[PDB]
Amino acid sequence: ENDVPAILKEIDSLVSREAVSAKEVSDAAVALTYLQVKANRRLWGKVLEKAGAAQDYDAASLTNLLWAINTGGVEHFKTVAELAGPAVSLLPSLSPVQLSIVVEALGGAGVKNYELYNKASAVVVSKIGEFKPAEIARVLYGVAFGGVNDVALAKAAGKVFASTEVDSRTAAQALYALAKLGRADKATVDALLKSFKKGTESASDAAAASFALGSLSFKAE
Amino acid sequence: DRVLSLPAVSKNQVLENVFHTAPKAPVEHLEKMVSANSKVYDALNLQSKRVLIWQVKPALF
């Protein structure tokens, strides 16, 4: 009764029909990351085929989709970069916890959308207290990897990382974003560097803080 | 001149004024739209052997 390949065929027949909506293609993508379906590429292809076809898109289904694209490690530039059309129209409609997932997924894929990151950084500095420290790092990872050298956000994120100390995975995203911006601010790197001997749980954030320190050439930890 | 009391319009000229146009068959609308909808079946069905769905929307693999 615990059927994982028989539920892949039931997801495959959900996205192979004719009028899949946004919520049915969000939850098909969310179910493919929780099931860890890197081996089936065509089933991930049928989901992103319907993700471009889906026209309505509320705030919750767009961020569930973009979370699943980012977490699952699936990249298709044409599909993800056209999901920045829903995002710039749902951007005042987005939660502060949801705007961090949109800009991290659209930024991490390299979507060159200057209208998105200008409005999504002007929101995150207009309400800087409304964002938790993991959300200000996700936006900072997005605006940095989306090709925007927004140092107004990198200062406002630096004041947050000095006032409250952050999680290990929160800091290593913020180090990776500042490494690509090439900032090497001693005031803020060392405020994020103390988060790494409380115990880190992933190796991906130990390796990314490793990369971000060496690229800014600070020293090992 | 008995021939001048006969009707001057010929039997030929009746049969070409009464049967002026070759009439449209009942079946020529079927077998002309069917052969044209067989191209709508071919290109646009999803069970045809020559669908355009992989030519116009290429599959993400």
Is A42 touching B (CB cutoff 8 A)?
yes
Distance from B59 to chain A by nearest Cα, in Å? 7
Q: How was this structure determined?
A: cryo-EM
Encode A205-220: b = buried (16+ Cβ within 10 Å), e = exposed.
Answer: bbebbbebbeebebee
Contact A16, A46 (CB under 8 A): yes
Shared domain for A161 and A96, answered yes or no, is yes
Nearby residues of B56 by Cβ (< 8 Å), 6 or more positions away: none
Euclidean distance between CA atoms B28 and A149, whole angstroms: 69
Q: Which residue of B has its CA nearest to A18?
A: B46
Shared domain for A196 and A102, answered yes or no, is yes
Resolution in angstroms comes to 2.9
Is A48 touching B (CB cutoff 8 A)?
yes
Shared domain for A54 and A27, answered yes or no, is yes
Going by the DSSP 8-state scheme, the letter that residue B22 receives in this structure is P
Residue A212 tokens read as 């971000």
Q: Which residue of A has its CA nearest to B57?
A: A49
Is A41 touching B (CB cutoff 8 A)?
yes
Shared domain for A193 and A98, answered yes or no, is yes
Euclidean distance between CA atoms A101 and A97, whole angstroms: 7
Shared domain for A60 and A93, answered yes or no, is no
Q: How many residues does chain B have?
A: 61
Contact: B59, A49; criterion CB under 8 Å:
yes
Q: What angle do CA A74, A134, A191 make, to 5 degrees?
A: 120
A163 Rama sector, left if φ>0, alpha if ψ -120 to 50, beta otherwise: alpha
Q: Among positive and negative, which fits the CA dihedral B1, B3, B9, B10?
A: negative
Contact A108, A75 (CB under 8 A): no
In A114-185, alpha helices (H): 114-126, 133-145, 151-163, 168-181
Picking from A125, A175, A184, A176, the residue whose alpha carbon sits closest to that of residue A150 is: A125
Shared domain for A140 and A189, answered yes or no, is yes
Contact: A49, B60; criterion CB under 8 Å:
yes
Encode B23-33: b = buried (16+ Cβ within 10 Å), e = exposed.
Answer: eeeeeeeeeee
Residue with tokens 């390299």: A110
Contact: A76, B57; criterion CB under 8 Å:
no
Shared domain for A143 and A52, answered yes or no, is no
Shared domain for A57 and A125, answered yes or no, is no
Q: Which residue of A has its CA nearest to B58?
A: A49
Nearby residues of A41 by Cβ (< 8 Å), 6 or more positions away: B61
Residue A6 tokens read as 């028989």
Chain B hits for A41, Cβ within 8 Å: 61
Encode A124-140: b = buried (16+ Cβ within 10 Å), e = exposed.
Answer: bbeeeeebbbbbbbbbb
Put simply, the chain A residues between 75 and 94 with a CB less than 8 A from any chain B CB are 76, 79
Shared domain for A123 and A171, answered yes or no, is yes
Task: Find the domain containing A72 and state its range.
Answer: 4-82
Shared domain for A172 and A161, answered yes or no, is yes
Euclidean distance between CA atoms A114 and A102, whole angstroms: 14
Picking from A90, A16, A86, the residue whose alpha carbon sits closest to that of residue A49 is: A16
Q: How many angstroms separate the most distant Cα atoms in chain A?
A: 55
Shared domain for A133 and A175, answered yes or no, is yes
B33 Rama sector, left if φ>0, alpha if ψ -120 to 50, beta otherwise: alpha
Encode A5-19: b = buried (16+ Cβ within 10 Å), e = exposed.
Answer: eeebeebeebbeeee
Phi and psi at A47, nearest 5°, equal: -75, -40
Euclidean distance between CA atoms B26 and B23, whole angstroms: 9
